[PDB]
Amino acid sequence: HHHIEVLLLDVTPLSLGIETMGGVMTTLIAKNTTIPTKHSQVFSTAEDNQSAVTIHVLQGERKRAADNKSLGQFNLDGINPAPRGMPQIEVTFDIDADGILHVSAKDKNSGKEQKITIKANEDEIQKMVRDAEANAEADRKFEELVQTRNQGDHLLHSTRKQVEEAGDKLPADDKTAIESALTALETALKGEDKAAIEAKMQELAQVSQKLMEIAQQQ
Amino acid sequence: HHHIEVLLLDVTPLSLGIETMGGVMTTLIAKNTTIPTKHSQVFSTAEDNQSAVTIHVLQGERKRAADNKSLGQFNLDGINPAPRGMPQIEVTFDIDADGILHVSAKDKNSGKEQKITIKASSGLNEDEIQKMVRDAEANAEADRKFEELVQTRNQGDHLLHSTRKQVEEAGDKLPADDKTAIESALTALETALKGEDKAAIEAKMQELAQVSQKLMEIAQQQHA
Ligand SMILES: [Ca+2]
Ligand SMILES: [Ca+2]
Ligand SMILES: [Ca+2]
B88 burial via Cβ count (<10 Å: 0-12, 13-18, 19+): middle
In a shared domain, residues B109 and B153: no
* Shared-domain flag, residues B195 and B221: yes
CA angle centred on A95, ends A94 and A100, rounded to 5°? 120
Characterise B83 by phi-psi region: left (phi > 0), alpha (psi -120 to 50), beta (else): beta
- Terminal CA-to-CA distance of chain A, rounded, Å? 63
Q: Are residues B130 and B145 in the same domain?
A: no
3-state secondary structure of B164: helix
Q: What angle do CA B169, B171, B175 make, to 5 degrees?
A: 170
Burial of residue B172, with CB atoms counted within 10 A of its CB: 0-12 exposed, 13-18 middle, 19 or more buried: exposed
The pair phi, psi for residue B171, each rounded to 5°, is 75, 75
Residues B180-218 as b or e (16 or more Cβ within 10 Å = b): eebeebbebbeebbeeeebebbeebbeebeebbebbeeb
Q: Which residue of A has its CA nearest to B29?
A: A39
On whether the CB atoms of residues B17 and B27 are closer than 8 A, the answer is: yes
Rounded CA-CA distance A145/A191 in Å is 9
Q: Which candidate, B139, B122, B33, places its Cα nearest to that of B71?
A: B122
A35 and A141 together in one domain: no
Closest CA to B186 of B214, B205, B165: B205
Q: Which residues of A124-135 are buried (b: 16+ CB within 10 A; e: fewer)?
A: ebeebeeebeeb
What range does the domain containing B117 cover? 1-140
**How far is CA B157 from its chain centroid?**
13
Elucidated via: X-ray
Closest CA to B90 of A10, A41, A37, A95: A37
Contact by Cβ (8 Å): A17, A26: yes
CB contact under 8 A, A21 and B1: no
Residues B66 and B130 occupy one common structural domain: yes
In this structure, the number of other CB atoms found within 10 A of the CB of residue B36 comes to 20
In 3D space, the residue among A92, A100, A93, A99 whose CA is nearest the CA of residue A9 turns out to be A99
Distance CA B88, CA A32 (A): 22
CB atoms within 10 A of CB A164: 9
Query: Which CATH number goes with the domain that contains A58?
Result: 2.60.34.10
Residues of chain A found within 8 Å of residue B42, distances taken between Cβ atoms: 7, 36
Within chain A, residue ranges assigned H as helices are: 122-164, 172-188, 194-206, 209-216
* Whether residue B195 is found in the same domain as residue B125: no
Residue A44 to residue B7, Cβ atoms within 8 A: yes
Amino acid at A126: Q
Q: How many helices (H) and strands (E) does chain B have?
A: 4, 9
Nearest Cβ partner for A50 among B2, B20, B37:
B2
Based on the fold, state whether residues B207 and B111 are members of the same structural domain: no
Q: Could you give the C-alpha distances from B90 to A45, A158, B28, B53, B95, in angstroms and in order?
A: 31, 43, 11, 12, 16
Residues A38, A67 contacting (CB under 8 angstroms)? no
Specify the number of domains making up chain A.
2
Do residue A64 and residue A149 come from a single domain? no
Are B84 and B151 found together in one domain? Answer: no
